[model samples]
Target chain A: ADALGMIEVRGFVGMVEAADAMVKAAKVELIGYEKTGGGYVTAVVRGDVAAVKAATEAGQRAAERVGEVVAVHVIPRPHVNVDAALPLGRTP
Target chain B: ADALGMIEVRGFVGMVEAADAMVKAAKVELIGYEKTGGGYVTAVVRGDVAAVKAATEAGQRAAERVGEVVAVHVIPRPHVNVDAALPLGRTPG
Candidate 1:
């Protein structure tokens, strides 16, 4: 992936809301999701740098309306090592 | 399980600290953990009602001293349905 984006929220509802808005707002794909305990969840997406950034912002806004958003971040150019270690939803 | 205990924190460090303190403080087993995203994580423990309650308190205190603890809770007698759906680190409920 050229860029990576993530939105962290306190519950499943927020993360799902974020995921919907994110994909609709930009040309990004919902790659994966992370679920901790006590309903904390994170949504991961991938796309071009600009698109990823845009999606993250959009997702954060949508999630905040309904769920507790913790953080939203984008990696303009994620390192190969990061791509290898973390789940990016694709295989070579 | 007789009871369930959890300590939620903003990062791995705090949750790890909580996990250690929880098991040490009471007769609880570190069953499993959940990590959502953005560094948010939770430590799960299980034991008798009193032991689980005591462990959660110890974990909360330790995590607060070192990391950002979000929430701590203990449920005495979790429902069987909950045991079945959620990851409680036990065999088939």
Candidate 2:
């Protein structure tokens, strides 16, 4: 599918703590993440629309407990752009 | 201008606490809300697109602190359907 949502977690002592909690609470396969300022982490996860939605909510719950939850923005994963995704074939 | 986002918060001990935390963290003016199953609360907030986006994120963080956050669903508010909206008297079009 397409990118469902991007969860930016804040209000914590460090970055890893928030990132790790997100991974656990969501319980979905965390595709990957990118590092941002102020000890913040942006995680990219993929799953069913419902599951992803659930995970995002769960991730927020996970973050709020540790410190202050910065934000949880749901990027609507419209199914139109699935063809032009990444990781295609390589020419020899 | 138009509806921005609807944040559905879960994973709290109860509805009131979650709703309260969302209100504070998001910092946006909450227009209204609806109660769902299993102690879940859905809040409709209207403001700058950026702020609503930010608040939704913040609300999630707030819910996590209270309990096992269940989920958050964001519904984009698209414009162009403004005139056809409800709760109006001049619907003679």
Candidate 3:
């Protein structure tokens, strides 16, 4: 993956909103989502570094409007081990 | 499933405590768990209705001591589709 974007939100509905905003904002692929619990859902996307950044910003904005947004991050180049262990959609 | 019990907690460590207490309290099976996230973890158990009820109470008490307990419920007999989709370790025959 060229870049990875993650938007963590408080609920399922907010996470869905974030994922939708991310894909609609840029030419990004929505890989999948992860559940960390206490109602925290993280939406993951992949694309170019700049596109990922834009997408994450849009996602955070959209998620916050609907529900609580925990954190948002865009990694230009993630570590190999992170991709292998986390649910970031990196094919090992 | 005969009966299903769920203990929703705030964190992973507390969820582990809930699951451990549930199995230890009664002759129940530790079914899988569900992660709702923001650190919400729900542990599931299954057995007879009475055992499920007892396990859920024990789980709630154990989890609340360690972390925040969000919710606890015991379903006497869950709907078929619930078993199909959720991570409660029910296999369709």
Best-performing candidate as measured by TM-score: 1
Candidate 3 interface RMSD after superposing interface residues: 8.8
Candidate 2 off by > 4 Å: A11-27, A78-92, B1-93
- Model 2, B2-93: lDDT tens per residue? 43545455532434455555455434566566567766666566554544565566666666666545556543454445425732121236
Per-candidate interface DockQ score: 0.07, 0.03, 0.15
- Residue B43 displacement (Å), model 3: 0.5
All candidates' lDDT scores?
A: 0.76, 0.53, 0.77
After superposition, the stretches of candidate 3 with alpha carbons farther than 4 Å from their true spots are A1-92
What is the lDDT for B87 in model 1? 60
Clashes of 1: 3
Q: What 10-residue stretch in candidate 2 chain B is worst by lDDT?
A: B83-92
CA lDDT, candidate 1, residue A61: 83
Across residues A1-92, which tens digit of lDDT does each residue of candidate 1 receive? Answer: 57899898785435545776777788877766766555667788888988999989988887777657888899898888888877775545
Chain A TM-score for candidate 2 is: 0.61
Query: What TM-score against the true fold does each predicted structure earn?
Result: 0.53, 0.37, 0.52
- Candidate 3 chain A vs. true chain A: TM-score? 0.94
Give the per-residue lDDT of model 2 (tens digit) for A7-54: 666534423444565456654556566557676766666544445566
Between candidates 1 and 2, which one is better according to TM-score?
1
